[PDB]
Write an enzyme that holds these catalytic residues in place. Sequence first.
Site, PDB file in Angstrom:
ATOM      1  CE1 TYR A  58      -4.029   2.013   0.729  1.00 14.57           C
ATOM      2  CE2 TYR A  58      -2.961   2.758   2.707  1.00 14.57           C
ATOM      3  CZ  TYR A  58      -3.978   2.839   1.802  1.00 14.57           C
ATOM      4  OH  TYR A  58      -4.988   3.766   1.993  1.00 14.57           O
ATOM      5  CB  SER A 131       2.986  -4.711   3.035  1.00 15.18           C
ATOM      6  OG  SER A 131       2.173  -4.229   4.100  1.00 15.18           O
ATOM      7  CG  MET A 132      -2.212  -3.994   1.757  1.00 19.15           C
ATOM      8  SD  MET A 132      -3.333  -2.696   1.216  1.00 19.15           S
ATOM      9  CE  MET A 132      -3.878  -2.123   2.815  1.00 19.15           C
ATOM     10  CD1 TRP A 155      -1.625  -5.080   7.101  1.00 19.32           C
ATOM     11  CD2 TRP A 155      -3.131  -5.500   5.505  1.00 19.32           C
ATOM     12  NE1 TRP A 155      -2.809  -4.516   7.490  1.00 19.32           N
ATOM     13  CE2 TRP A 155      -3.753  -4.756   6.534  1.00 19.32           C
ATOM     14  CE3 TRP A 155      -3.895  -5.886   4.394  1.00 19.32           C
ATOM     15  CZ2 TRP A 155      -5.095  -4.396   6.496  1.00 19.32           C
ATOM     16  CZ3 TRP A 155      -5.224  -5.524   4.357  1.00 19.32           C
ATOM     17  CH2 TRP A 155      -5.814  -4.792   5.398  1.00 19.32           C
ATOM     18  CG  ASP A 177       5.426  -5.333  10.291  1.00 23.11           C
ATOM     19  OD1 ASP A 177       4.826  -4.248  10.359  1.00 23.11           O
ATOM     20  OD2 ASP A 177       5.501  -6.002   9.244  1.00 23.11           O
ATOM     21  CG  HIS A 209       5.727  -2.929   7.306  1.00 22.47           C
ATOM     22  ND1 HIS A 209       5.056  -4.128   7.289  1.00 22.47           N
ATOM     23  CD2 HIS A 209       5.225  -2.209   6.273  1.00 22.47           C
ATOM     24  CE1 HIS A 209       4.211  -4.146   6.270  1.00 22.47           C
ATOM     25  NE2 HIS A 209       4.276  -2.978   5.657  1.00 22.47           N
TER      26      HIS A 209
HETATM   27 CL   LIG Z   1       7.721  -0.951  11.381  1.00 24.41          CL
HETATM   28 CL   LIG Z   2      -7.576  -7.864   2.162  1.00 28.19          CL
END
Ligand SMILES: [Cl-]
Ligand SMILES: [Cl-]
Length: 264
Positions: A58, A131-132, A155, A177, A209
């Site tokens: 993201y 992540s996403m 994520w 994270d 992260h």
């Molecule tokens: Cl972080």
């Molecule tokens: Cl989602």
Amino acid sequence: GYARGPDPTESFLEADSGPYTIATSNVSSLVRGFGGGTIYYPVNAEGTMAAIVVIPGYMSYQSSISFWGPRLASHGFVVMTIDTNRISDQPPSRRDQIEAALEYLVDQSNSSRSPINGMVDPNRLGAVGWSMGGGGTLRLAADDGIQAAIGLAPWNTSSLGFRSIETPTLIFACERDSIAPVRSHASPFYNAIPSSTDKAYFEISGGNHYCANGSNRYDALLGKYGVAWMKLHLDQDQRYAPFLCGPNHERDRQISEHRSTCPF
Ligand SMILES: [Cl-]
Ligand SMILES: [Cl-]
Ligand code: NA
């Protein structure tokens, strides 16, 4: 059958570059289904190779995960780091864009106008997502839309869609994270995947992260395990299994936790 390159050692896997020299081709955002990207590919590789798409998270661009382009491609893979249609896109949309980007690489390998003509084996496709983008990668894996998956500090809204993944899946978790906290994302994602699936979990001690994005202090570890994963599963290259199954990974100060379904 699909194995290429010299017999690996720890030093070979930790180095910044693999043994192939590489070239790049830019893909305009005009491309259908994703926001463009950069293809990294070996220059003097005989025959077809597995293809891998690397996707950011993201509010991020391709440059955030660029380490993975040269690091994988220099070990004998066609690797495209991509942008999404919008940096605000969520994991379901990211899943579709990974799929479209892999289709693009397969199609270009069949085009006489492409520099990657004849380079991609459509049977052997992987994805790496932060992540996403990692949620999108795991979602695609849940359809068996890939032969190997790597999640970088993934994520996703839930772990509940991941309980039937058979795609061999490696998750890098960043211990500290606060954006995709391991207790709510990486760890339950790994635990949701069936125990009969080849899977591995490497939690990076103290990790922020961005810890699994590379171009950082963890490059030796990230590339060693990530390349080994793709070699073992996309190339069926058993020479790489001893780097994943056997070592006491947690003895490394950089690894706060390891889980796996070894032996594969
Ligand atoms: Cl972080
Ligand atoms: Cl989602
Ligand atoms: Na596009």
